[PDB]
Symmetry: D2
Subunit: 386 residues, 4 copies
């Protein structure tokens, strides 16, 4: 039951099932994982592909010879399994050089170096066939107000992304960029903190169509926001290039629980939205098996991500196909929300006496929206109590 297949487009970062369990207050609870074993275990689970930071695949500071061998070993695991690599990203946050950021570090020479680090790995990711390159500016921010002139840092951020788009244009690459928002942690406040802030920033870029967003369930929930609403604006803007699925209990540190844990109802509305909008990119999981777990629990965790997606997919589809729900949807006038407000034109609106002079405001106000019956119907479908 609810079994994933590579057609379901499930992918994982190497850093997810690979997380050794070091937290702010704790040491590692698990040994490191060869990227090769992760590709195989995930393939066995029904995964479609894997993603990586540059330093997850080639250990930082590796020699050219070792780099070649680390890729050779990795390529052979994908060949053996059929695994894909749909996305890659640069680690511009772990090494101490990035302590004040990467593309927006105050030191100019750190910013130039962060660009060379990203450009090197774009080459690699294109070779492995990734279609999306992700940027997570987790060190772009500040803990105190005077350490970062934000308008200046946005200037620098725009130059970094403009230059990156100039590079892939100059190489003929098909890869596109996806910014991953996060409101805080590790910096006290991170720049482009939400899906909205990232969409707005893309529109000031030189070639905007080259960039989209990679929202993560938990990051919007770290700011108390509605994740499906944010996804809806990303899809409305045509900029859902990639997505990160996980779970989060409200406003606290970045938990990265397996998908479906945390806010279960919001996961349901998310899957219903992705499916009904026909989202076709990877269903990528960016989670951390809690450091209480041994290797066996790591894989049960990753298996739980895909299962919970498949369960929610079925419930949400049953929801939208139920004729009682379709009748309730008409009752709540969801059909009327899809109709244009004034297809007749401004002038027609200005003269339509039934829109002001003769609008029975009290009659309209007395019409219930019937939202509770609709929502209780959604809950019954979620829980299988119809």
């Amino acid at each position: 039951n609810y079994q994933p297949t590579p057609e379901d487009r499930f992918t994982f970062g190497l850093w997810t099932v690979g997380w050794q369990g070091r937290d702010p207050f704790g040491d590692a609870t698990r040994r490191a994982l060869d990227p090769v074993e992760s590709v195989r275990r995930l393939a066995e689970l029904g995964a479609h592909g894997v993603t990586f930071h540059d330093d997850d695949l080639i250990p930082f500071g590796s020699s050219d010879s070792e780099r070649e061998e680390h890729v050779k070993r990795f390529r052979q695991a994908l060949d053996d399994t059929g695994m894909k690599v749909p996305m890659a990203t640069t680690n511009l946050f772990t090494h101490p050089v990035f302590k004040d950021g990467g593309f927006t570090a105050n030191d100019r020479d750190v910013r130039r170096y962060a660009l060379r680090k990203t450009i090197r790995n774009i080459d690699l990711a294109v070779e492995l066939g990734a279609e999306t390159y992700v940027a997570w500016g987790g060190r772009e921010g500040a803990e105190s107000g005077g350490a970062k002139d934000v308008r200046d840092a946005l200037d620098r951020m725009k130059e970094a992304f403009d230059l990156l788009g100039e590079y892939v244009t100059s190489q003929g690459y098909d890869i596109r960029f996806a910014i991953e928002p996060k409101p805080n942690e590790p910096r006290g406040d991170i720049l482009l903190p939400t899906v909205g802030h990232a969409l707005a920033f893309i529109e000031r870029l030189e070639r905007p169509e080259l960039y989209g967003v990679n929202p993560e369930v938990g990051h919007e929930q770290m700011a108390g926001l509605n994740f499906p609403h944010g996804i809806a604006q990303a899809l409305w803007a045509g900029k859902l290039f990639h997505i990160d699925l996980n779970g989060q209990n409200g406003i606290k540190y970045d938990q990265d629980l397996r998908f479906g844990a945390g806010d279960l109802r919001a996961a349901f509305w998310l899957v219903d939205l992705l499916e009904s909008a026909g989202y076709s990119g990877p269903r990528h999981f960016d989670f951390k098996p809690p450091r209480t777990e041994d290797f066996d629990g790591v894989w049960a965790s990753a298996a739980g991500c895909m299962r919970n997606y498949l369960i929610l997919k079925e419930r949400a589809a049953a929801f939208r196909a139920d004729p009682e729900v379709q009748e309730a949807l008409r009752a709540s006038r969801l059909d009327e929300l899809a109709r244009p407000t004034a297809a007749d034109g401004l002038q027609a609106l200005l003269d339509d006496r039934s829109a002001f002079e003769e609008f029975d405001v009290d009659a309209a106000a007395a019409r219930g929206m019937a939202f509770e019956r609709l929502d209780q119907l959604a809950m019954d479908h979620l829980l299988g109590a119809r």
Copy 2:
């Protein structure tokens, strides 16, 4: 000391000092205020102008005759004082007809009516000389996931604003629009919840240059975000048309404390940003004298808003002019953040061996940012302990 003058551009809504003190769990603690007395008391305090919702000035459902008289009385108060009216807005939230929203209500006929209500008041606001019309979509949202298809609601929101911009274009008006974001309350989640989400939405509008944002200190703080950072992206985008100043203690209900209360340090960084960016619009206060206060406390509260702005203005200016702070700013390389990252070009960057092959990563990582000394200098200036 720290005394405001109309040149300081301080303005107030009628609804602020006019708030009778009805909260979710409480009845009014103060009688209603004639808009005329508010104009006079505020003028006495050194205010520059007032703003209004349509229904703050003309009681809802007033006859044409009464409407004329309510304006006549108001115009005479501004003449008597020199008060201005720099901004107005529509009340699309109080009357029960707007319970599911205004421009995005599911019922089409409510949306058409909300447009006629706004268009009527734009006329009025232009007559009183407002330069900015504000939209706060406080009822645009939902409490449950199925009651609002967000992509549909954004379609409707785009039509409403496109139509409004078509109207002021057709009339030759100079007025511009400013969207006021809010993440939640009264709806469970509000659409365009943050400054970012509002900037992104404006870029999909038909004539974007006609629209900007009207951020409110407390609304971004309701989502745990850094208000000065948000303002910085608005100014970077050129869309700070208007601003709402108040105070807020973190993530909870919308408090609307007088400006300077709540997060005092963020108020300092905000004033420093507005001043150094040369923000020239009104310094508008959108606050609520706590319902514990009588009329005398209402005016002490409004007086505290302007005073706290003036105090912070002085401290922040002393901060940026102190040569020790200018030396610290160089120490933390804030000057280097303002320099372009690769004015030399992509190709020069790709060949600059000092940016990768010969970058001493460990030397750069070992250079402290000196952010703490800088911040302690800012604190000393704030508190007057230099």
Copy 3:
């Protein structure tokens, strides 16, 4: 399916289904409800009883004659239905006199009056047979630091509750008190903000066994806390006298969604705890039909509360009875958590070399907790996907 019966002990406040829909920014969307019709509609729904504030039942300032008639009418509705009245409370928050609090108002004469208001209604509630009197100090708090010396206000709070316990002792009443915590709203910060703070305060009271807590799902979630954990400490302390069930989306204004909405998984762990601990008090719903709803939606909302409780009751019972879950519970050593740590005594512990000198720390650290398989089993039961 999942149909409630009065044996299920479901109760409602008059103020819940009675809420006219006035919010901070909106007018009423529904007419007022005669308490009699609410008793009948709720009875029809399978409810067990109703609760009331004094002013929900007798309008504030009623004459003795009218008071008698309002009770006569109410008593006859309970007789006609079999409805009970298991709990009552005082409204010490709506009238403007309570703007600085009730039992802790700065004005002494307001505090004395709040005590007389409560004592009058205790008499009434005992007559209607309530077994619990609830105190919600929603106005006990402050918006600014200097307006309330907290240690003084706790002195006053202790005197109010000591006096109340002296009264019911002097009358021979069986009724007990339950404090209802809330962290904020309407005050900027409320005293005794959490279940913990309320438990601690009770232990300083003169006759502590007379007082317990009445936690509300949403109020602990307004402070980002785990509601089942809080309930567990209340039950561990023996002070779960009453409970308020509803739903809440994280840290924001007090939403009072119907039970089961908001955090669905936490509702599941709550019902599992209440049932397995054998909680026997009323299952009281303190919710607000969203003001989008007409009268029909009000009753669908209240019906959804009981249904969602019954659904969760079944899933959680199926969870604890599943032998796979019982095997997983042993795997995660939940049985070992119930065993005493050192039944052998301090001295035996101090000499047990297998507890320090010869403890294989690395072997123990390498044992996974298997928490993910356990949790995925709980999720499968919740969703009916076993």
Copy 4:
């Protein structure tokens, strides 16, 4: 100006200025510190003492010989400086064995080992002369609902603390215990999440007077709570044995900013409370120099903690001594809040017709509290603008 002296009772953990800068997403930015150099640098800064976890002072797994030498070296640094050691604590969170907790780990043998680890270090701390032993149960909690029966875990927590109090009683020690609350991180939810929850738990202990709380500014602010209010209830309960001073920007990860950063106004109300209550324990700083800083910035950070305390001490004292503020305090009836509510007795209250039958509710409701003038006076004192 504002210079600390050992009489000011300022102390620091070794782990604070000793923090190498490893965060969830980053490697160390600073070398490790010999505890000896920290004692000397802090002494030079005007600190009074240092605190330590067992593993900050003796590296985990040290041989008896090395242990002796690490203490010998440490004792000589305190002798050379006059530094004291007023508090110590056990590290029951870093080693992987504690991944499911210490005193409440599901594995019994981990709990026994955690007790032996604590008891060993109590001996040591008494030798160095600490007067308070702190317990921070940062691993006592859970990420999912089924992994920890909370009532069971409280049973285990009560046994651990009862046993610890049995030990210090059996040894004649004077040391007392202080529980340090935290709502979350590293566990998804931590047991005893707030000051309140910790006070309530102490009252169920065998010898409660042996235990108090060690609240930390940032931990209560992680749950949106008012830190001075929490301190006020701790002092009202007589259980402020110790305190941790730092700074925190609202509800997010545990930031541990230097004291005075984050919520500046709440720091002011805190210092005013500690001083006016005559708190006499150590003023302990539990902060992290941001990993952007080199060694020089570490010490500027620690210096900023004490300075900001001294500045706030002066402003708050000037506040309480200003006769205008004393007149305002009477205006807001803070004097009346300190008076008993019914010193005359229940019966006198029941017969006092001026408390109900003849209470002019409308007159009392119309009296403003004058809280805004009072608060603006407090702000003027904070900023030095009187």
